Amino acid sequence: ICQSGDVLRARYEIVDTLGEGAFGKVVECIDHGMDGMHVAVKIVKNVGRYREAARSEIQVLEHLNSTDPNSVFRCVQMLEWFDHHGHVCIVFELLGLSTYDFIKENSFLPFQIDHIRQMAYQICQSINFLHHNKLTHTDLKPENILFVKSDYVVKYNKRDERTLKNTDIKVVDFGSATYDDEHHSTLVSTRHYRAPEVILALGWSQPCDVWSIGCILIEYYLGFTVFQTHDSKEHLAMMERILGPIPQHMIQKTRKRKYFHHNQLDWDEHSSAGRYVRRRCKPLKEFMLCHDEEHEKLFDLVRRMLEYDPTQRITLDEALQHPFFDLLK
Numbered sequence: 001i002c003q004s005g006d007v008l009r010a011r012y013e014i015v016d017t018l019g020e021g022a023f024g025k026v027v028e029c030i031d032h033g034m035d036g037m038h039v040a041v042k043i044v045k046n047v048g049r050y051r052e053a054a055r056s057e058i059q060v061l062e063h064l065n066s067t068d069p070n071s072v073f074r075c076v077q078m079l080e081w082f083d084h085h086g087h088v089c090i091v092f093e094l095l096g097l098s099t100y101d102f103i104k105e106n107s108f109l110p111f112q113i114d115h116i117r118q119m120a121y122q123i124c125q126s127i128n129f130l131h132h133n134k135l136t137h138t139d140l141k142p143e144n145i146l147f148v149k150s151d152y153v154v155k156y157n158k159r160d161e162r163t164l165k166n167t168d169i170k171v172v173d174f175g176s177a178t179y180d181d182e183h184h185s186t187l188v189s190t191r192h193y194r195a196p197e198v199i200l201a202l203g204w205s206q207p208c209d210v211w212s213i214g215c216i217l218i219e220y221y222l223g224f225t226v227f228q229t230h231d232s233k234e235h236l237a238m239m240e241r242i243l244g245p246i247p248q249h250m251i252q253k254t255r256k257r258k259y260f261h262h263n264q265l266d267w268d269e270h271s272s273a274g275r276y277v278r279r280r281c282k283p284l285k286e287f288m289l290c291h292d293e294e295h296e297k298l299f300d301l302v303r304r305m306l307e308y309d310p311t312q313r314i315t316l317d318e319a320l321q322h323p324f325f326d327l328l329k
């Protein structure tokens with residue numbers, strides 16, 4: 001099935017597990033057919049659910065390769081796919097650590113505002129390309145943003161701390177990507193990066209990605225997940241504490257009645273969970289570690305990404321032309 005030394009399509013020799021999930025595994029292989037060069041191979045376990053989903057992911061990746069074969073817009077490059085005894089195998093270019101894992105290995109230290117500016121721009125560009133081709137990723141998170149090379153310099157400070165030689169990224173995991181004119185799932189996104197219109201089941205499209213990007217940028221800035229919760233009402237409570245009250249037209253629209261009471265969130269601030277929310281969250285501007293002009297610009301862009309109403313949320317067309325990105329051009 002999957003072993004170190006095992007060979008796929010008479011070619012790819014597994015030499016290291018790079019990670020695991022509910023789908024299966026992603027392994028590093030030596031490609032003997034390309035005189036040794038390393039690749040990453042997503043092996044999908046033989047559950048009928050994951051098999052049919054992979055064939056949709058494959059279709060998206062072929063689409064992105066067709067429209068952008070040279071990865072101008074930084075989507076991961078699929079090299080081939082094949083069946084290996086019931087397991088769907090997808091071969092990818094070999095990339096570095098995820099932006100999540102880099103933080104994790106760097107003592108949970110945040111990225112410097114200048115690295116954030118570069119990465120944010122690349123992320124926005126990549127996802128805007130998806131949005132102009134009638135796609136929504138739906139699952140953007142730091143784990144799905146990977147460095148091309150994770151090469152770092154160690155500099156003693158309090159002890160050892162890491163800095164990227166290069167911040168160029170790629171976006172991975174198109175297994176949930178959805179076209180405009182296709183069946184939209186009810187529930188999308190990993191919990192922490194999920195937009196309020198999803199939680200409230202009002203229907204979603206492109207803008208839900210922008211919300212996720214917002215969540216990602218904050219997490220880069222602070223070095224920790226802002227919505228650390230496994231409960232939807234609590235999640236909504238965290239949003240209100242950070243962002244202000246949920247707009248009334250959205251509360252009126254939702255069928256999710258259990259969250260509300262008289263069109264206000266049914267949340268007790270003086271509970272065990274209420275105390276947890278309050279010590280973990282605060283109004284957005286109060287998160288600013290430094291009070292520079294560019295930090296104000298960043299927090300302005302983030303606020304616009306974290307607009308409650310998806311119809312009023314900043315688009316990525318607009319985001320790319322935001323003052324925060326001026327210092328890059």
Ligand SMILES: O=C(O)c1ccc2c(c1)nc(Nc1cccc(Cl)c1)c1ccncc12
Pocket residue numbers: 018019020021024025026040042076092093094095096098172173174
């Ligand atoms: O899904 C894709 O499209 C996808 C595409 C490429 C990679 C990937 C996922 N995941 C990687 N690593 C990884 C890290 C943590 C957990 C898991 Cl399951 C995998 C990885 C590593 C090195 N090069 C390319 C990749």
